[PDB]
């Protein structure tokens, strides 16, 4: 029913589908990204998502408490999820800051990125139409690189702190703090408009994308695969990470406990509908992105894979071109950027609310004692602001890319999902989990979910991990910039901040149990009442 969609899909459908998926697909060569994407989807995404929903509904609480009633030994999964959300909230709002900056720069009679007569623009610029009348540069890309971003030559040169981006971040975080502290949510009649406007904007942008000349090459690049490319563990990691990130895998359990607590509802069918909708909107926005990419390739006379940045700025490079090739470009640009802000703000609100609830669940005696509820939210928003302030500098793009790749992505999500599935399937028991689901919703999961939890997800996780550490390649920004060893170490430290949460809590709880070691393992493995 549409009620479930308007109630739930707002927190899942966000920037990950319209922005993260297109650039991951473009980075991996287009069509080769889709096969592992769908394999990971139908192997783990929906099953693990339903597992998170069941875990949340079983205890009526987030990851801070539900794991104590399943397996006390592996209680570190909740802390890992909490730190994953903490790292995600720092860098997810940088996209909203960029969108706000673009929206503010859109209040002009002519879009700044439509032409390159301005002062920030390099002499190498040449108009796209006149480029195919050398090493010329399109105004749309170099605008994004120099005005909005002011890209430093490397991460070793942080440069100055951009004040305009800092104030945009301040505005977005003030909105977030006000909404969280005032309990503002999309419960009013405006929820219909808030949900329906992004899809209408995406449909308009897609319609614009198809009618551009040369879009057929873009669709061909999007859909035609390259087997040899799949042999690159990078594409497998990207597909699995995108599947886990778009569906909030290892993050859903803290919010589904309250959101998905409605009784008499079909949890299985609701999860299936959400999975269909999210994958559909992602795959649909892929066509819109790749049609614009193909049109740019045909206009500039260059290969499709070389037209734009193979990084987070693919959306901010492609979509402004589309709104510039529409009648009254300012109006369409403004609409698109309010749409992007609305998609990001709801997901950010859901994530911040989940983080706050989990953290106050780690300390109810102090934070819930009174007026501390607002002070904790203010402190969280201030600390996240100070952490994100590193990413608005001239070299902030490299830090943003590192955080995107490692902090809430990569091997950490595979690690957490593999441990969750392994625990639930083998240590807690698949036969007991099926009985619990039978008691909760009335019917057992069946064979697909059971086998996916038992074998399919762990096998995929360990296979991707082994293929990554056997064919490892360094992380790179764009197609040429190689990261320094210290940046790679920082990214690995960000990943390990969540990766080590399981073994450390395991050893801490093992040292907290009296008696022999075997007695300690027996006590910690047995679920609590």
């Amino acid at each position, epitope marked *: 029913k549409i009620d479930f969609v308007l109630s739930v899909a707002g927190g899942f459908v966000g920037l990950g589908n319209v922005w993260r998926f297109p650039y991951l697909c473009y980075k991996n060569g287009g069509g080769a990204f889709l096969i592992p994407y769908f394999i990971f989807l139908f192997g783990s995404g929906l099953p693990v998502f339903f597992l998170e929903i069941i875990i949340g509904q079983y205890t009526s609480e987030g990851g801070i408490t539900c794991w104590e009633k399943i397996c006390p030994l592996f209680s570190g999964i909740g802390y890992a999820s909490v730190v994953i959300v903490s790292l995600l909230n720092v860098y997810y709002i940088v996209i909203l800051a960029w969108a706000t900056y673009y929206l503010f720069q859109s209040f002009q009679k002519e879009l700044p990125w439509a032409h390159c007569n301005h002062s920030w623009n390099t002499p190498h610029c040449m108009e796209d139409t006149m480029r195919k009348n050398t090493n010329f540069t399109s105004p749309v890309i170099e605008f994004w690189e120099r005005n909005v971003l002011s890209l430093s030559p490397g991460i070793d040169h942080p440069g100055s702190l951009k004040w305009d981006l800092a104030l945009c971040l301040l505005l977005v975080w003030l909105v977030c703090f006000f909404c969280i502290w005032k309990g503002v949510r999309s419960t009013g009649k405006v929820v219909y408009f808030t949900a329906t406007f992004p899809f209408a904007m995406l449909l308009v942008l897609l319609v614009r994308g198809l009618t551009l000349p040369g879009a057929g090459a873009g669709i061909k690049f999007y859909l035609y695969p390259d087997i040899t490319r799949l042999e690159d563990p990078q594409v497998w990691i990207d597909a699995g990470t995108q599947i886990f990130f778009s569906y909030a895998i290892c993050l859903g359990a803290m919010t589904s406990l309250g959101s998905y607590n409605k009784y008499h509802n079909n949890v299985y069918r609701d999860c299936m509908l959400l999975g269909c909708l999210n994958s559909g909107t992602s795959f649909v926005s892929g066509f819109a992105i790749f049609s614009i990419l193909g049109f740019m390739a045909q206009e500039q006379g260059v290969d499709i894979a070389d037209v734009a940045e193979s990084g987070p700025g693919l959306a901010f490079i492609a979509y402004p071109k589309a709104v510039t090739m529409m009648p009254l470009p300012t109006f369409w640009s403004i609409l698109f950027f309010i749409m992007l802000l609305l998609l990001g703000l709801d997901s950010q609100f859901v994530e911040v609310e989940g983080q706050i609830t989990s953290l106050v669940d780690l300390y109810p005696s102090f934070l819930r004692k009174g007026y501390r509820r607002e002070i904790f939210i203010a402190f969280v928003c201030s600390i996240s602001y100070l952490l994100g302030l590193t990413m608005v500098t001239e070299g902030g793009m490299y830090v943003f890319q590192l955080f995107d790749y490692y902090a809430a992505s990569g091997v950490c999500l595979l690690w957490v999902a593999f441990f969750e599935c392994f625990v639930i399937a083998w240590i807690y028991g698949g036969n*007991r989990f099926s*009985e619990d689901i039978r008691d909760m919703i009335g019917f057992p999961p069946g064979p697909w979910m059971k086998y996916s939890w038992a074998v399919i997800t762990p096998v995929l996780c360990v296979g991707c991990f082994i293929f990554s550490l056997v064919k490892y390649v360094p992380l790179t920004y764009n197609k040429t910039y190689v990261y320094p060893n210290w940046a790679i170490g920082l990214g690995w430290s960000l990943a390990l901040s969540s990766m080590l949460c399981v073994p450390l809590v395991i050893v801490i709880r093992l040292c907290q149990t009296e008696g022999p070691f075997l007695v300690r393992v027996k006590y910690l493995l047995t679920p609590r009442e």
Partner: antibody
Amino acid sequence: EVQLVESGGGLVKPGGSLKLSCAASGFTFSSYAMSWVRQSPEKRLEWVAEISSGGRYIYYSDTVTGRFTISRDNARNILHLEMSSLRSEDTAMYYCARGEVRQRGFDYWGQGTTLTVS
Amino acid sequence: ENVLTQSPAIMSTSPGEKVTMTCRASSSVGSSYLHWYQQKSGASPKLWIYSTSNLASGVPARFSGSGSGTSYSLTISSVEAEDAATYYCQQFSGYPLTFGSGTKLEM
């Protein structure tokens, strides 16, 4: 999913104790929930108790919650129903039914056994 | 306990005609949490209709079911001699489980 057979019915005095049996074959008894359905001599159906596939979750009717107890034997695929105190209204014919799916109901029913109190 | 009651306890019928019998519940039950069972005279009951629409494997399309909220019913396109039996409505929405008073075709 072929056979269900009950056993253990007999004649007892009021207030006594008796244990019923329900044998199963042709399907995985350890993965299917089992419930007992009671048919009064007036032909009225009444639910008694339900036991989960693993036996951890167990429910009883309000009329027999304090006197009845249900157990299962996954190794022998035998379902047991033990009662401590049979009242005058406890005389009926007992059926064991497979109730693994709540949205589907009792798929299979056994032959049943009569219990008489006097 | 949600007491379920069926009004037409006795239904005299003519062979080949259509017969519809209804079940009522004291509280609203889900559409997927009510089922019907057929019990032959002197035989054990058997599942007949589940989820209020899905016919069982052992029953042809001749039988049908419909209903929602607190009211539910089943329909027979044309009753034959083999259709003479007792039918019970049962709920699975919440414990304790309850069965209807039953409706027996008298012809």
